[PDB]
Amino acid sequence: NFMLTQPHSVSESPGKTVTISCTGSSGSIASNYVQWYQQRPGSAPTTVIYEDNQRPSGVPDRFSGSIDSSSNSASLTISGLKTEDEADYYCQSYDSSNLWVFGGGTKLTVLGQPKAAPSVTLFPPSSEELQANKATLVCLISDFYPGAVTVAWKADSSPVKAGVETTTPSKQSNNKYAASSYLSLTPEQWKSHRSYSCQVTHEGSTVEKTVAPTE
Amino acid sequence: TNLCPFGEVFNATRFASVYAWNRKRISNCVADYSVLYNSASFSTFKCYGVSPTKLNDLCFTNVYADSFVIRGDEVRQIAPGQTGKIADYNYKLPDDFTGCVIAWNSNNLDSKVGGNYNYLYRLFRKSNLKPFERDISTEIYQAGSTPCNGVEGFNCYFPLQSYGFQPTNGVGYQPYRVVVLSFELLHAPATVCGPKKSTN
Amino acid sequence: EVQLVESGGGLVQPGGSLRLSCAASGFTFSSYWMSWVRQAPGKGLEWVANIKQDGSEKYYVDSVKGRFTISRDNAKNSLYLQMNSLRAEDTAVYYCTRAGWVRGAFDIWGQGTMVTVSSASTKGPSVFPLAPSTAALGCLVKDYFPEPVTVSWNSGALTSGVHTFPAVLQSSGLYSLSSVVTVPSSSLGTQTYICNVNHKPSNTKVDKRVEP
Ligand SMILES: *[C@@H]1O[C@H](CO)[C@@H](O[C@@H]2O[C@H](CO)[C@@H](O)[C@H](O)[C@H]2NC(C)=O)[C@H](O)[C@H]1NC(C)=O
């Protein structure tokens, strides 16, 4: 039960320095070697850092691994950012109980434009679909940067684990991103509650939208 | 092809205590490091100053296999720049250390229902140990300004404490066996190499 | 020059079998450990299996333990993964990697091979209206398989405010998307606003009138 946990997304300017953390959950980071893998969308991963601070031949000086003896965590650091570095970065180590564990990954977005809050639109199930004994709420997110959000659903104040289906954000043609989240419901549950809520988190700021059956 | 005595150092019935840590010089042999990485059984395996993979194609004057026992949550202190009970008064490692640290859980061997107090560690010391220094002194730690004259009371503490290794202990309390390999490069015969053994 | 080439992926319905194969080149294959790392689409990396460089010890994840068998032919410079009794969660891209001792350093990554495990057959989608309250309406293209699908607006003429969102592979293994257009408030009531869906595999075309 030794998980590696790293944040979801970080961002910085064309030149800057940026640091991605990777903290062990149960077991000592620096009890074994910690690797870092770069992965641009659709491509295979490549190794930027092996054996704690070490970089393969070909990787620029900008990348630098390290290990914090205090927080039980390693950290990748990219001094003097370059837009080519925009990718997902996974950390990885080994443990005798859970062999070859991997991090969650972190999307490093090199900011080419100002950050932008997402425009969220939520639709209730249609009159037609309610006839069909099904009900789907459609939450539509667009025009946000960088490309990562977090979508949560609240049944009338309360969380909803089942039924939710959410797309991974994809680039529209202004270099911003857009995603959609669907709540697969039943007509019984839809008419039951006073309202359903779609809550989208993005770089701290959360945007909420809510609909009510009665009409 | 003299095969270096790693079977004797790692597979060893009795290990030392950390304040009184064992050492085993290694010379005049061919060192098959392949077994030590391909194992995967060890809980900690990190080397400092040299990548393990490129060790078969390496030669050294002497290898030093320090071997002792500490509790689970103390292996972090066997590393450069580390501090704590073990790294300061029992076994210190230098900043420019050049070698490997290997440890595995030994609660099935160094524990016993009731507690195996056989292994000790040092509680108090006048000051920190120099790198690779040993301290087997049983001198009563004078914790006041009044001397102790060789027996402990108030302001007087027998400096060696024990380890209550029980097989139900928490992992951070369970016993581990550490083997610290030290590599030496003197302007000297350099009589220890790995697989690439075409020079003799 | 190191390169790894995975083969033998594709589509298979649940409970079935499938055999992957990855071809090594440019390095001493008999001198490295070999591992499979998978990656569910839109999700992270997960290690799957590792095999010692003779084929003596094999290791896996508990997820696939008992169902996946790893092997290797050192002479033929090839690594294999016999995947039997597959599930939906096994859907991922399956990379083959060099690791090199046992403790890390997954040196090189092949380009991967796709493995899709879906019990879904080709089906045309149901279409539902979004019926707005600047307004925004659209259509809901539900439960079709496989991708792609096509959405025109107002028989192909309207193209100004349209935003066709990507689909989801829902729990049922059936895709579903929705496409919307923002329009003037005073454009409703006096505008047809039909949406035209074409699912080429299922060959079903559906035009849906969207009205407040
Ligand atoms: C400690 O002893 C074990 C066994 O007594 C050694 O291990 C074996 O290595 C051979 C290599 O040919 C394998 O075929 C066996 O399967 C291994 N057995 C076990 C139980 O691991 C081991 O190498 C010894 N330790 C050291 C450091 O030499």
Side-chain angles (χ1 to χ4, degrees), chain B residues 9 16-17 29 46 70 77 97 102 124 139 145 153 157 161 167 185:
Chain B
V9 176
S17 295
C29 56
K46 321 189 36 161
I70 41 184
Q77 297 170 62
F97 174 59
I102 309 176
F124 307 109
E139 161 262 344
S145 39
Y157 301 105
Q161 184 66 302
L185 209 68

PDB file of all heavy atoms in Angstrom, chain B residues 9 16-17 29 46 70 77 97 102 124 126 139 145 153 157 161 167 185, unseen atoms left out:
ATOM      1  N   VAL B   9      29.038 -12.347   3.966  1.00  0.00           N
ATOM      2  CA  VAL B   9      28.669 -11.075   4.579  1.00  0.00           C
ATOM      3  C   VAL B   9      27.155 -10.937   4.683  1.00  0.00           C
ATOM      4  O   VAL B   9      26.619 -10.601   5.745  1.00  0.00           O
ATOM      5  CB  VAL B   9      29.289  -9.905   3.792  1.00  0.00           C
ATOM      6  CG1 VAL B   9      28.827  -8.578   4.370  1.00  0.00           C
ATOM      7  CG2 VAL B   9      30.807 -10.001   3.810  1.00  0.00           C
ATOM      8  N   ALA B  16      26.196  -7.955  13.912  1.00  0.00           N
ATOM      9  CA  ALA B  16      26.666  -7.124  15.007  1.00  0.00           C
ATOM     10  C   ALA B  16      25.585  -6.135  15.440  1.00  0.00           C
ATOM     11  O   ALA B  16      24.484  -6.082  14.884  1.00  0.00           O
ATOM     12  CB  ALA B  16      27.946  -6.394  14.606  1.00  0.00           C
ATOM     13  N   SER B  17      25.912  -5.339  16.452  1.00  0.00           N
ATOM     14  CA  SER B  17      25.115  -4.186  16.834  1.00  0.00           C
ATOM     15  C   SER B  17      25.649  -2.949  16.123  1.00  0.00           C
ATOM     16  O   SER B  17      26.770  -2.935  15.610  1.00  0.00           O
ATOM     17  CB  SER B  17      25.134  -3.984  18.349  1.00  0.00           C
ATOM     18  OG  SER B  17      24.514  -5.070  19.017  1.00  0.00           O
ATOM     19  N   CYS B  29      39.729 -10.765  -5.515  1.00  0.00           N
ATOM     20  CA  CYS B  29      38.628 -11.605  -5.968  1.00  0.00           C
ATOM     21  C   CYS B  29      37.855 -10.879  -7.059  1.00  0.00           C
ATOM     22  O   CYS B  29      38.051  -9.686  -7.302  1.00  0.00           O
ATOM     23  CB  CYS B  29      37.705 -11.986  -4.805  1.00  0.00           C
ATOM     24  SG  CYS B  29      37.024 -10.579  -3.889  1.00  0.00           S
ATOM     25  N   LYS B  46      20.397   1.684  -2.530  1.00  0.00           N
ATOM     26  CA  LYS B  46      20.844   2.892  -3.210  1.00  0.00           C
ATOM     27  C   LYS B  46      22.351   3.021  -3.060  1.00  0.00           C
ATOM     28  O   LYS B  46      22.894   2.793  -1.976  1.00  0.00           O
ATOM     29  CB  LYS B  46      20.176   4.170  -2.669  1.00  0.00           C
ATOM     30  CG  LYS B  46      18.699   4.058  -2.313  1.00  0.00           C
ATOM     31  CD  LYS B  46      18.105   5.430  -2.001  1.00  0.00           C
ATOM     32  CE  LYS B  46      18.716   6.508  -2.891  1.00  0.00           C
ATOM     33  NZ  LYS B  46      17.900   7.751  -2.981  1.00  0.00           N
ATOM     34  N   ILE B  70      19.748  -2.404  12.730  1.00  0.00           N
ATOM     35  CA  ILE B  70      18.985  -1.327  13.347  1.00  0.00           C
ATOM     36  C   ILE B  70      17.503  -1.600  13.122  1.00  0.00           C
ATOM     37  O   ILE B  70      17.119  -2.475  12.343  1.00  0.00           O
ATOM     38  CB  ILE B  70      19.365   0.061  12.787  1.00  0.00           C
ATOM     39  CG1 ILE B  70      19.549  -0.008  11.269  1.00  0.00           C
ATOM     40  CG2 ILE B  70      20.612   0.591  13.467  1.00  0.00           C
ATOM     41  CD1 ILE B  70      20.005   1.294  10.649  1.00  0.00           C
ATOM     42  N   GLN B  77      18.704   6.916   8.094  1.00  0.00           N
ATOM     43  CA  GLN B  77      19.884   7.603   8.600  1.00  0.00           C
ATOM     44  C   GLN B  77      21.184   7.075   8.010  1.00  0.00           C
ATOM     45  O   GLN B  77      22.222   7.726   8.175  1.00  0.00           O
ATOM     46  CB  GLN B  77      19.948   7.503  10.126  1.00  0.00           C
ATOM     47  CG  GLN B  77      18.799   8.179  10.850  1.00  0.00           C
ATOM     48  CD  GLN B  77      18.774   7.845  12.328  1.00  0.00           C
ATOM     49  OE1 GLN B  77      19.712   8.155  13.063  1.00  0.00           O
ATOM     50  NE2 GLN B  77      17.696   7.209  12.773  1.00  0.00           N
ATOM     51  N   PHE B  97      30.679  10.193   0.479  1.00  0.00           N
ATOM     52  CA  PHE B  97      30.618   8.737   0.489  1.00  0.00           C
ATOM     53  C   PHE B  97      30.503   8.180  -0.924  1.00  0.00           C
ATOM     54  O   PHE B  97      29.805   8.736  -1.776  1.00  0.00           O
ATOM     55  CB  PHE B  97      29.425   8.281   1.336  1.00  0.00           C
ATOM     56  CG  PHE B  97      29.178   6.801   1.297  1.00  0.00           C
ATOM     57  CD1 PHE B  97      30.152   5.910   1.712  1.00  0.00           C
ATOM     58  CD2 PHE B  97      27.964   6.302   0.851  1.00  0.00           C
ATOM     59  CE1 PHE B  97      29.923   4.547   1.679  1.00  0.00           C
ATOM     60  CE2 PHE B  97      27.730   4.941   0.817  1.00  0.00           C
ATOM     61  CZ  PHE B  97      28.709   4.062   1.232  1.00  0.00           C
ATOM     62  N   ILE B 102      22.502  -1.285   1.536  1.00  0.00           N
ATOM     63  CA  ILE B 102      21.584  -2.383   1.252  1.00  0.00           C
ATOM     64  C   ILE B 102      21.035  -2.903   2.573  1.00  0.00           C
ATOM     65  O   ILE B 102      21.801  -3.166   3.506  1.00  0.00           O
ATOM     66  CB  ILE B 102      22.276  -3.518   0.470  1.00  0.00           C
ATOM     67  CG1 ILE B 102      23.001  -2.969  -0.761  1.00  0.00           C
ATOM     68  CG2 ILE B 102      21.267  -4.572   0.057  1.00  0.00           C
ATOM     69  CD1 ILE B 102      23.786  -4.011  -1.526  1.00  0.00           C
ATOM     70  N   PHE B 124      23.684   7.941  24.244  1.00  0.00           N
ATOM     71  CA  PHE B 124      24.363   9.197  24.521  1.00  0.00           C
ATOM     72  C   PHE B 124      25.841   9.088  24.174  1.00  0.00           C
ATOM     73  O   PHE B 124      26.436   8.009  24.236  1.00  0.00           O
ATOM     74  CB  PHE B 124      24.210   9.610  25.992  1.00  0.00           C
ATOM     75  CG  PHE B 124      22.786   9.641  26.468  1.00  0.00           C
ATOM     76  CD1 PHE B 124      22.320   8.690  27.361  1.00  0.00           C
ATOM     77  CD2 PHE B 124      21.916  10.623  26.028  1.00  0.00           C
ATOM     78  CE1 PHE B 124      21.011   8.717  27.802  1.00  0.00           C
ATOM     79  CE2 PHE B 124      20.605  10.656  26.465  1.00  0.00           C
ATOM     80  CZ  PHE B 124      20.152   9.701  27.354  1.00  0.00           C
ATOM     81  N   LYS B 126      29.562  11.944  23.916  1.00  0.00           N
ATOM     82  CA  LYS B 126      30.097  13.285  24.136  1.00  0.00           C
ATOM     83  C   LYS B 126      29.829  14.199  22.946  1.00  0.00           C
ATOM     84  O   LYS B 126      29.408  15.349  23.120  1.00  0.00           O
ATOM     85  CB  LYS B 126      31.597  13.209  24.428  1.00  0.00           C
ATOM     86  N   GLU B 139      31.525   3.291  28.859  1.00  0.00           N
ATOM     87  CA  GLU B 139      31.684   4.256  29.939  1.00  0.00           C
ATOM     88  C   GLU B 139      30.348   4.901  30.283  1.00  0.00           C
ATOM     89  O   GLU B 139      29.610   5.340  29.395  1.00  0.00           O
ATOM     90  CB  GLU B 139      32.711   5.319  29.541  1.00  0.00           C
ATOM     91  CG  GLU B 139      32.646   6.610  30.345  1.00  0.00           C
ATOM     92  CD  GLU B 139      31.879   7.706  29.631  1.00  0.00           C
ATOM     93  OE1 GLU B 139      31.652   7.575  28.408  1.00  0.00           O
ATOM     94  OE2 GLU B 139      31.508   8.701  30.287  1.00  0.00           O
ATOM     95  N   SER B 145      27.202  17.337  36.292  1.00  0.00           N
ATOM     96  CA  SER B 145      28.563  17.777  36.563  1.00  0.00           C
ATOM     97  C   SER B 145      29.269  16.900  37.588  1.00  0.00           C
ATOM     98  O   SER B 145      30.486  17.025  37.756  1.00  0.00           O
ATOM     99  CB  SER B 145      28.564  19.234  37.042  1.00  0.00           C
ATOM    100  OG  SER B 145      27.473  19.489  37.909  1.00  0.00           O
ATOM    101  N   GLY B 153      22.791   6.121  38.104  1.00  0.00           N
ATOM    102  CA  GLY B 153      21.671   6.561  38.928  1.00  0.00           C
ATOM    103  C   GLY B 153      21.074   7.800  38.317  1.00  0.00           C
ATOM    104  O   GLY B 153      20.927   7.885  37.091  1.00  0.00           O
ATOM    105  N   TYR B 157      23.895   7.389  33.258  1.00  0.00           N
ATOM    106  CA  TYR B 157      23.143   6.548  32.334  1.00  0.00           C
ATOM    107  C   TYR B 157      24.095   5.657  31.552  1.00  0.00           C
ATOM    108  O   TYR B 157      24.972   6.154  30.839  1.00  0.00           O
ATOM    109  CB  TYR B 157      22.296   7.397  31.382  1.00  0.00           C
ATOM    110  CG  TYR B 157      21.309   8.288  32.098  1.00  0.00           C
ATOM    111  CD1 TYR B 157      21.529   9.653  32.214  1.00  0.00           C
ATOM    112  CD2 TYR B 157      20.157   7.760  32.666  1.00  0.00           C
ATOM    113  CE1 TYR B 157      20.628  10.469  32.871  1.00  0.00           C
ATOM    114  CE2 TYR B 157      19.250   8.566  33.325  1.00  0.00           C
ATOM    115  CZ  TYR B 157      19.491   9.920  33.424  1.00  0.00           C
ATOM    116  OH  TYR B 157      18.591  10.728  34.080  1.00  0.00           O
ATOM    117  N   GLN B 161      21.687   1.362  24.899  1.00  0.00           N
ATOM    118  CA  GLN B 161      20.302   0.938  25.034  1.00  0.00           C
ATOM    119  C   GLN B 161      20.060  -0.280  24.145  1.00  0.00           C
ATOM    120  O   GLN B 161      20.866  -0.615  23.276  1.00  0.00           O
ATOM    121  CB  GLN B 161      19.359   2.098  24.680  1.00  0.00           C
ATOM    122  CG  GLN B 161      17.858   1.852  24.869  1.00  0.00           C
ATOM    123  CD  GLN B 161      17.452   1.657  26.323  1.00  0.00           C
ATOM    124  OE1 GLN B 161      17.944   0.761  27.010  1.00  0.00           O
ATOM    125  NE2 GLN B 161      16.542   2.501  26.797  1.00  0.00           N
ATOM    126  N   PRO B 167       8.084 -10.104  17.116  1.00  0.00           N
ATOM    127  CA  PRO B 167       7.505 -10.300  15.778  1.00  0.00           C
ATOM    128  C   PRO B 167       6.150  -9.639  15.577  1.00  0.00           C
ATOM    129  O   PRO B 167       5.599  -9.729  14.473  1.00  0.00           O
ATOM    130  CB  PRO B 167       7.392 -11.828  15.672  1.00  0.00           C
ATOM    131  CG  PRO B 167       7.264 -12.286  17.085  1.00  0.00           C
ATOM    132  CD  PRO B 167       8.123 -11.354  17.893  1.00  0.00           C
ATOM    133  N   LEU B 185      39.520   3.784  -4.047  1.00  0.00           N
ATOM    134  CA  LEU B 185      40.321   3.999  -5.253  1.00  0.00           C
ATOM    135  C   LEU B 185      41.600   4.717  -4.838  1.00  0.00           C
ATOM    136  O   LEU B 185      41.671   5.949  -4.836  1.00  0.00           O
ATOM    137  CB  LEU B 185      39.543   4.790  -6.300  1.00  0.00           C
ATOM    138  CG  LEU B 185      39.923   4.516  -7.756  1.00  0.00           C
ATOM    139  CD1 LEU B 185      39.525   3.104  -8.160  1.00  0.00           C
ATOM    140  CD2 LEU B 185      39.292   5.543  -8.685  1.00  0.00           C
TER     141      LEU B 185
END
